[PDB]
Amino acid sequence: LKITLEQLAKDCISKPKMREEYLLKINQASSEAQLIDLKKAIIRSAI
């Protein structure tokens, strides 16, 4: 499920700093609710 969010975020955003920060937050978080919330937030942040 980790690489799920990783591939999705890579498919969503373009900014380098934002991409790096988001991937950092993904590859270390371990609370499933936070993973769902990452999905929601990042897929919302595409304008």
């Binding site: 499920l1 690489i3 799920t4 591939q7 999705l8 769902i36 897929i43 595409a46």
Partner: protein, 1901 residues
């Protein structure tokens, strides 16, 4: 060698037992048995000896024979894949065979390269011009060079060679060694059962090498085809990366790899469903599948974190930045790694994990789904039965269900039946209901798997410490005596015995239980299986595709959420105590007790087993073993019905607009909402998502209640992600599921009856599926060429029965031109090419031969080194042939080698089987002298005057010998069973050699088609200069079939070819093509993946239209139906002679031996069936899935608005070619937008002209009398006539739940239409609050204003522009007062009808209700009197009651009530209560119509300068008004908007062809209304001996100017009139430039079809510049049929010139008129118009004047046509015309003269009875034409009623005979006894001609 070569593609699994048995029989360096080896060795194998030889070879031949620890010498059978990939035997010197193969194919390609390219380019020009574009070059040579001389092929070649060597070795073994190939870098050992590889060593059994060879050839095919530019580098890179990686991993792990590949299957959908609009579904399935891959990978100890993470990342990497279709293809190829090897233990263990696991069932849930099974069954049976329900349906509480029962309500709402329990209890132990058994002799003639008796192991395998069976159900049943399909069932349902032990593979068991099994399944699927709801699977193909695409569409509008449940384990999960409810219900429903469940019972006291680890085990033993648990695939129909039940229940448990589809176990559901139509897509998808989530949660809960561990592995949900039977559906289109079928591009077909021909066959069909979707067509054509070439090479070198003698192979392998001229001709007409061109754009057939010569002419005239082969085909020696050979198939050219051996093998097998029979009198079903009688009957039917093979085949099919051959043909053809048949050796020795050398003789024949033979002189000219295929086909068929029948030359077939006839032309933006009628539209639409709201149209799905033109003491269907069709065809609907009817009755009397003998002097009901093309056979088997592709035949907008046929019932004589034309247009359009595209391409149309026809061949109809009196021999067990108006209304409004026969009518038609509609709705009233008048009208209109389709058909095909609409608006049935409209009128009529009935309902209970068993008419009367009381009541309530008599009592009481309050005459109150009967609507209607065919006056009851201008605007008239572009043609209503109304032409009264100058005098009148300066008089591109002249006659100018489109070859009439008075005193800029280099008025006129921009702007430019070189006003012909273009055209004109005034005509019939119209720069004004497309108009109200003037003109011209068909004139303007500018006299006895002509023509007819042309059609047509002209000349002698008759007839009903019976005035009678039918016997241009002639005559005198 002798017969039946082994297979080429496995249909058997690969195990780990047998390969280990081999490799451990000898010493070849865990297992599931460790017992003994020397036992096997001396255990009589000789494979021990052979493998001793193998080990001797290997040990003595390699150096590493005895060393330390094998470290130099390793054998890895653990699925090495990188090793087969590695150079195992890659040493460059190939066997000289394969190099020859390459040389031959490459040379053939280099030869035929240039020709096929020109063929395709000329095919493109012929259709539209330069198709097949990309937004770079292709060629056949490029195909072979990038497909076969590229890498990744040598491996496939190597393994093909290995496969052939092993095949031939196995053959030699069957005939009763090994082959040893010693060589540098490797060693090869091939045994008939095992092969060795080394260079690092491995072994492969027979099936294994087959699997790997297939795998490699398929993989090569896929990557190579992907090298073609079609679906390019993305997929190539991805497939190669994935292949390398997964093969590496398969070596890295072992069998576990397959599991992830399994998961990789479903993985795609996840990657595919990452649809950014709707969330949470991506993170659902993607994450689930990735985690499951992680588990199934780690479970076998690879690595902890780094390797797992990275390998998963890399397995996901090949799916990024793609489009859906590409992903689907990548799936279908992602399955490419060979079917894994099996092991008994694991499969047995899993299916044991499906053994006892818990009796956890929820009684409420199972009871609820039981209730719904009950309601489904009851509703269905009431539906089709159309009477009452079951005999007992109400046992239990609630008088409400009892009400439903006693009242016989056809419906039981799901919402209702949810609120109750035990809705019925059809359970007893007495009798049977609504069915019977003992039918369908098919099933038992089919064999399935069958197991051994109790003592199994010793029969199932060897290695014991004993008896074998090797039986067969088919042999047993065919060799069974006293078999009764019935008594077996009671023997089963009675006392069981311990002789039943089922085995597991598929599944099989003993004979008796399998027999009763198939019997029970037949019963279910035959009677109960029919009752289907919530699923569109009734019809075979059309219904399937249509329903599917409609679901995927109805998801969306200009509410979509699906989910699907898919897996097979679902089936093996049920248990007894959750099936006996339905089992018992159905069992008692069909009578006999405890039947539909017995399987479980047996499985209770029984064990199973899937090779066996022996310690001591021989009987009932507990545990590789199964102990009494479901089943794999038996009885699953009940599973389907129960799944239907549960899906219905879970649906109705919430608000769920549900739609369903299901096959086997895989099912898909759509659910819908009532979303508000303003929220964005996200919100609508969100509501749909909530709804499907509720439905899904409920579904899962209910399944678990019933017990189904339904998980996320099997259920996938989305909004736009349908799936069904491996075919995915995405946003309203089928995905390109091509490449999987691409992987089927094998090298040889199935071995049974293997032969070159059949091989290529599969190729074609395979390529054909490739043609259907995705890849561009031309690539498919080239690919078929390449494949036939390569396969012919592969068969001609190293044949499997290779012979070194002959020279045919020598001459083949010597020259390449020969193989090309064998692979480039239609296989139907000899050769190995199956439908290159025609089938490329259609799945239908027509005639193969005409299509064959179409192919041939295309290729030759394009140039493929072929001209002389045609004459050789002509003078080809005609084959042997026979009456029966011609009989069993028409469309058949007599050639020697056209039946592949597999057919002869099938025949021999079935006949040898039928030789075994100890059954009931079915013995007589086979007799030895059958085929003699067959050929005899073929002769009797075919050795006559005029013979038709189509009717020949139909009759021979339905006759006595027909169904006999059919029975003997419906047997299996499996390799096993045909082998067992051949075990009866005596077929013959001759045919043995024949099949033993087939392909050789075929190639010898076609080689005899060497350089040309001698060309006889007649045919030399007869065929030269390829005029038209059809005549060539006719002559070829004649000359070929000649030697048998000779003189007679059969015809009556051969509809033309689509690509031959149709020419067509495409148009984008501004396009001009061939001067002038179907057309297809395609607006500027963004493809799939954009926005649902931005899709320009409402996406409407069209389908390849396949219609079925289907319109008494016992009536239940039987063979009696067969005799019905027999007589109906055999009588031809015209040939009605005592001989003919006696013969039809006789063939019947021999056919039906079903009841007693049938002696009816005349079978009464047999109706006419040769008047139509209702003659064919099909639709028997289960499924046919591979439908089609649609991704832009979705926004398509067809319309048949131009003339192809008139008011008529052509009934599939033209619909066939019409079907082909529609599908062909669709295919053209798709191919023009095939690859990845956008909306970048702009709005585009396609106009197909049918005018270019080198021969048309008008139809004919005649009779003959056959007589040879031979017969088969068998006796075995098998006043005023408004009744037409009544029946027409009945059928029409019956269809709503085609203007012929509605032509002789009255307003009583719509009267009774309203009557029937009101009757039905009134019964539906149930006394809901509706007061008499206004509310009944309102509710009627509201129930009417819905369900368009049928109303569309009615409107179009009856209310069309001929007199029907004229009569309608004359009787005020409609009302046309912005409405540019045609549809609304329709419904108004019906409403009006109903309203009118109300008025009669005001006073009178008349109109004599009619019906087409007596309870039916009673309840009809009940319905009527209910309507009456509802209208004329309105004083007291009333109650519902019974159907039979209760409402009658209520009516009598209410009448006695209203006795004191009414409107009518009071006594008729009793007469209020004071019913006609028929048989069937269609027969009675058409028979009564054809009974009106007596000269009658039923038509009586049906009984110049007055045009103006619409002066649009003036200078600076800017005031844009609202568009209101509401327009016709919502869906494709039939072809009648402006097609045909020619009777107007009399108002241009001269006898010439131009006749346009009338418009001239009109426009000159309007001109004289206006001042105009000095003249120049330019007439651009028109004036063709026409109008223009009169203009100078009324308006002379100076220096006239003339133009017309230059063609192959000048204004005629202009010179024909004026120059005496004179002398008295397609291109853009070159032509307009010639004009500018060469003031006053100009004249211009053309027309084309829909394109929302102008294309003749150059001519407005012309006017601007010419007046620059003033106020010189234009003349511009145009019309607002597409009013949008008209408004756009006027806005474009509004550029410069102000004061524009258009004037209407007065000569064009009721039709959208052909009205005549009078900034900075041109392109910028054009752009102003373009941006003004949406909202810009200046005609907001002037439409009022236009349309009231149009109705004025319509009335005026109708009156004028009736004036001039009478003696009056329209003068004071015809003289102005004439100034500038058959002759027979009249007598009363012109009718006598017509009698003379009739007698003489009939004498000619009887005389003639006693390249080339026609026989009786020509003379009869000339007779009728002559009679027509004579009548138009003698017009002035007139019984005027007859003149009105013929006036109508010419007005559509063309030429019914006047003097019908007076043809009486003996020999001229008896010589042709059908004089009446003959007397009872239409082309547009001829009609215009006769109207003009009639006008000229009536003006002349």
């Amino acid at each position: 060698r002798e017969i039946l070569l082994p297979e080429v593609h496995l249909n058997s699994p690969i195990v780990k037992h047998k390969l280990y048995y081999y490799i451990l029989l000898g010493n070849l360096p865990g297992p599931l048995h460790n017992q003994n080896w020397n036992q096997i060795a001396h255990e009589e194998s000789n494979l021990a000896q052979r493998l001793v030889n193998v080990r001797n070879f290997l040990i003595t031949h390699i150096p590493d024979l005895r060393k330390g620890h094998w470290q130099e010498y390793v054998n890895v059978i653990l699925w090495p894949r990188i090793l087969p990939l590695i150079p195992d035997f890659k040493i460059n010197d190939q066997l000289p065979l394969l190099k020859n193969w390459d040389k031959l194919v490459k040379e053939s390609c280099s030869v035929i390269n240039a020709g096929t390219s020109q063929c395709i380019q000329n095919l493109s020009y012929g259709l539209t011009g330069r198709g097949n574009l990309f937004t770079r070059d292709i060629d056949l040579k490029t195909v072979v060079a990038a497909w076969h001389d590229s890498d990744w092929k040598r491996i496939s070649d190597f393994w093909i060679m290995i496969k052939f060597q092993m095949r031939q070795l196995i053959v030699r073994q069957t005939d009763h060694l090994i082959t040893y190939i010693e060589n540098r870098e490797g060693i090869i050992i091939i045994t008939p059962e095992l092969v060795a590889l080394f260079n690092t060593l491995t072994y492969m059994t027979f099936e294994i090498v087959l699997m790997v060879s297939d795998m490699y050839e398929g993989r090569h095919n896929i990557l190579s085809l992907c090298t073609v530019s079609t679906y390019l580098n993305p997929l190539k890179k991805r497939i190669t990366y994935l292949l390398s990686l997964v093969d590496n991993l398969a070596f890295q792990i072992g069998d576990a790899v397959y599991n992830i590949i399994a998961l990789l299957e479903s993985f795609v959908y996840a990657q595919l469903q990452m649809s950014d609009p709707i969330p949470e579904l991506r993170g659902q399935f993607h994450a689930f599948v990735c985690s499951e891959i992680l588990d199934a990978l780690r479970g076998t100890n690879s690595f902890t974190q780094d390797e797992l993470r990275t390998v998963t990342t890399n397995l996901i990497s090949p799916f990024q930045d793609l489009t859906p279709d590409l992903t689907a293809e990548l799936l279908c190829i992602m399955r490419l790694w060979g079917h894994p090897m099996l092991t008994a233990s694991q499969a047995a263990g899993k299916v044991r994990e499906s053994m006892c696991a818990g009796k956890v069932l929820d009684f409420p849930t199972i009871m609820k789904t039981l209730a719904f099974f009950h309601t489904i069954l009851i509703n269905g049976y009431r539906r089709k039965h159309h009477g009452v329900w079951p005999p007992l349906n109400l046992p239990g509480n609630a008088s409400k269900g009892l009400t439903e029962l006693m009242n016989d309500n056809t419906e039981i709402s799901y919402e209702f039946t949810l609120k109750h329990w035990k809705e019925v209890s059809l359970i007893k132990f007495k009798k049977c209901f609504d069915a019977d058994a003992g039918e369908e002799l098919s099933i038992f003639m089919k064999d399935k798997a069958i197991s051994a008796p109790k003592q199994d192991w010793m029969s199932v395998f060897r290695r014991s410490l004993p008896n074998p069976f090797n039986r067969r159900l088919l042999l047993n049943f065919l060799g069974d005596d006293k078999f009764d399909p019935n008594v077996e069932l009671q023997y089963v349902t009675s006392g069981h015995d311990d002789t039943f032990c089922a085995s597991y593979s598929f599944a099989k068991l003993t004979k008796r239980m399998r027999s009763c099994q198939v019997i029970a399944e037949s019963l279910l699927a035959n009677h109960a299986g029919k009752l289907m709801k919530e699923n569109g699977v009734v019809m075979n193909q059309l219904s399937l595709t249509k329903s599917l695409l409609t679901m995927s569409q109805i998801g969306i509008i200009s509410a979509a959420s699906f989910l699907t449940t898919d897996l097979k384990k679902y089936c093996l999960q049920w248990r007894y105590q959750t099936i006996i409810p339905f089992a018992q219900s159905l069992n008692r429903m069909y009578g006999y007790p405890h039947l539909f469940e017995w399987i479980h019972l047996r499985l209770m006291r029984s064990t199973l087993y899937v090779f066996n680890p022996p310690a001591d085990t021989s009987q009932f033993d507990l545990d590789i073993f199964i102990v009494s648990p479901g089943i794999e695939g038996l009885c699953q129909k009940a599973w389907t019905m129960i799944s239907i039940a549960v899906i219905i229940l879970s649906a109705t448990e919430s608000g769920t607009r549900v739609m369903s589809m299901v096959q086997g176990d895989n099912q898909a559901i759509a659910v819908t909402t009532r979303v508000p139509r303003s929220l964005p897509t996200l919100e609508k998808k969100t509501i749909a998502f909530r709804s499907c989530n509720l439905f899904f949660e409920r579904l899962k809960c209910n399944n678990f209640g019933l017990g189904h561990h339904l998980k996320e592995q099997e259920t996938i949900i989305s909004s736009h992600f349908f799936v069904y039977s491996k075919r995915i559906f995405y946003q309203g289109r089928i995905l390109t599921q091509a490449l999987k079928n691409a992987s089927k591009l094998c090298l040889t077909a199935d071995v049974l009856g293997e032969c070159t021909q059949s091989s290529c066959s599969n190729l074609a069909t395979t390529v054909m599926r490739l043609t259907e979707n995705g890849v561009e067509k031309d690539i498919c054509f080239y690919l078929n060429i390449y494949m036939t070439i390569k396969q012919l090479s592969y068969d001609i070198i190293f044949p499997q029965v290779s012979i070194p003698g002959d020279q045919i192979t020598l001459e083949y392998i010597n020259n390449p031109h020969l193989v090309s001229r064998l692979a480039l001709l239609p296989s139907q007409l000899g050769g190995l090419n199956y439908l290159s061109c025609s089938r490329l754009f259609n799945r239908n057939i027509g005639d193969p031969v005409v299509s064959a010569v179409a192919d041939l002419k295309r290729l030759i005239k394009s140039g493929c080194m072929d001209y002389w082969i045609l004459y050789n085909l002509l003078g080809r020696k005609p084959g042997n042939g026979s009456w029966a050979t011609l009989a069993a198939d028409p469309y058949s050219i007599n050639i020697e080698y056209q039946y592949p051996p597999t057919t002869a093998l099938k025949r021999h097998t079935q006949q040898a089987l039928m030789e075994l029979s100890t059954n009931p009198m079915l013995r007589g079903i086979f007799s030895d002298n059958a085929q003699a009688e067959e050929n005899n009957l073929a002769r009797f039917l075919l050795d006559r005057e005029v013979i038709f093979p189509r009717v020949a085949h139909i009759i021979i099919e339905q006759t006595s010998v027909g169904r006999r051959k059919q029975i003997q043909g419906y047997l299996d053809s499996t390799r096993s069973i045909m082998r067992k048949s051949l075990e009866i050796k005596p077929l013959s020795n001759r045919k043995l050699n024949e099949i033993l050398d087939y392909n050789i003789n075929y190639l010898a024949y076609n080689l005899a088609l060497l350089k040309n033979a001698i060309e006889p002189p007649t045919y030399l000219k007869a065929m030269t200069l390829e005029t038209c295929s059809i005549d060539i086909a006719r002559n070829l068929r004649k000359l070929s079939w000649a030697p048998l029948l000779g003189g007679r030359n059969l015809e009556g077939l051969e509809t033309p070819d689509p690509i031959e006839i149709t020419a067509g032309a495409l148009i984008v933006g501004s396009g001009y093509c061939e001067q002038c009628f179907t057309w297809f539209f395609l607006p500027s639409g963004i493809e799939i993946g954009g926005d649902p709201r931005d899709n320009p149209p409402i996406r409407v799905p069209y389908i390849g239209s396949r219609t079925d033109e289907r319109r008494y003491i016992r009536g239940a269907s039987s063979s009696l139906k067969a005799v019905l069709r027999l007589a109906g065809v055999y009588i031809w609907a015209f040939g009605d002679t005592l001989e003919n009817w006696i013969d039809a009755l006789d063939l019947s009397h021999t056919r039906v031996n079903i009841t007693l003998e049938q002696l009816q002097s005349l079978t009464p009901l047999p109706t006419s069936a040769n008047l139509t093309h209702r003659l064919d056979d099909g639709t028997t088997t289960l499924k046919f899935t591979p439908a089609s592709s649609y991704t832009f035949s979705s926004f398509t907008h067809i319309s048949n608005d131009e003339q192809y046929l008139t008011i008529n019932d052509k009934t599939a004589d033209s619909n066939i070619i019409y079907q082909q034309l529609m599908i062909t247009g669709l295919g053209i359009l798709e191919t023009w937008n095939n690859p990845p595209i956008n909306r970048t391409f702009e709005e585009s149309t396609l106009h197909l002209h049918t005018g270019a026809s080198c021969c048309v061949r008008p139809v004919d109809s005649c009779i003959l009398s056959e007589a040879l009196t031979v017969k088969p021999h068998i006796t075995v067990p098998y006043g005023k006539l408004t009744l037409l108006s009544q029946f027409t209304a009945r059928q029409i409004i019956n269809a709503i739940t085609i203007s012929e026969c509605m032509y002789t009518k009255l307003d009583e038609l719509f009267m009774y239409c309203g009557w029937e509609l009101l009757l039905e709705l009134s019964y539906q009233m149930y006394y809901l609050r509706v007061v008499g008048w206004s509310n009944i009208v309102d509710y009627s209109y509201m129930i009417l204003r819905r369900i368009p389709g049928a109303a569309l058909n009615n409107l179009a095909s009856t209310l069309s522009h001929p007199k029907l609409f004229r009569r309608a608006i004359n009787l005020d049935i409609v009302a046309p007062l912005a409405s540019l409209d045609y549809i609304k009128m329709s419904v108004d009529a019906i409403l009006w009808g109903c309203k009118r009935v109300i008025n009669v309902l005001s006073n009178g209970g008349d109109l004599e209700l009619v019906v087409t068993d007596r309870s039916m008419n009673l309840i009809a009367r009940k319905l009527t009197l209910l309507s009456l009381i509802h209208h004329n009541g309105l004083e007291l309530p009333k109650i519902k009651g019974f159907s039979p008599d209760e409402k009658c009592f209520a009516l009598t009481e209410f009448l006695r009530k209203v006795v004191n309050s009414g409107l009518s005459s009071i006594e008729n109150l009793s007469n209020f209560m004071y019913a006609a009967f028929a048989s069937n609507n269609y027969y009675l209607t058409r028979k009564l119509l054809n009974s009106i065919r007596d000269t009658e006056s039923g038509q009586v009851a049906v009984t110049c300068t007055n045009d103006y201008i619409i002066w649009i605007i003036e200078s600076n008239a800017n005031l844009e008004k609202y568009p209101i572009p509401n327009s016709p043609e919502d869906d494709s209503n039939f072809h009648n908007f402006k097609l045909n109304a020619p009777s107007h032409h009399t108002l241009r009264p001269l006898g010439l062809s131009s006749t346009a100058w009338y418009k001239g005098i009109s426009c000159c009148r309007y001109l004289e209304r206006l001042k105009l300066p000095q003249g120049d008089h330019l007439y651009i591109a028109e004036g063709s001996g026409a109008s223009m002249t009169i203009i100078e006659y009324l308006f002379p100018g100076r220096k006239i100017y003339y133009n017309s489109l230059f063609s192959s070859g000048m204004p005629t009439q202009f010179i024909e009139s004026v120059p005496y008075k004179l002398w008295q005193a397609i291109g853009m800029t070159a032509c307009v430039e010639f004009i500018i280099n060469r003031c006053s008025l100009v004249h211009v006129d053309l027309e084309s079809s829909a394109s929302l921009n102008q294309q003749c702007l150059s001519k407005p430019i012309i006017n601007a510049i010419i007046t620059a070189t003033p106020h010189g006003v234009l003349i511009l012909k145009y019309s607002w049929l597409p009013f949008t273009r008209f408004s756009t055209l006027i806005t474009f004109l509004w550029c410069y010139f102000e004061r524009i005034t258009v004037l209407r005509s007065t000569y064009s019939d009721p039709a959208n008129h052909e009205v005549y119209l009078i900034t900075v720069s041109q392109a910028t004004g054009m752009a102003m118009t373009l941006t003004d497309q949406g909202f810009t108009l200046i005609s907001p109200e002037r439409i009022n004047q236009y349309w009231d003037g149009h109705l004025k003109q319509e009335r005026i011209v109708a009156e004028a046509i009736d004036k001039v068909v009478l003696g009056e004139n329209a003068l004071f303007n015809s003289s102005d015309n004439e100034l500038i500018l058959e002759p027979v006299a009249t007598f009363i006895e012109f009718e006598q003269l017509i009698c003379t002509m009739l007698t003489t023509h009939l004498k000619e007819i009887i005389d003639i009875t006693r390249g080339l042309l026609g026989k009786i059609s020509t003379i009869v047509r000339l007779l009728t034409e002559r009679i027509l002209n004579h009548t138009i000349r003698n017009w002035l002698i007139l019984p005027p009623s007859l003149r009105m008759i013929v006036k109508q007839d010419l007005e559509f009903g063309i030429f019914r005979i006047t003097s019908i019976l007076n043809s009486d005035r003996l020999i001229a009678q008896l010589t042709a006894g059908y004089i009446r039918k003959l007397i009872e016997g239409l082309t547009r241009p001829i009609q215009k001609q006769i109207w003009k002639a009639l006008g000229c005559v009536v003006y002349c005198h």
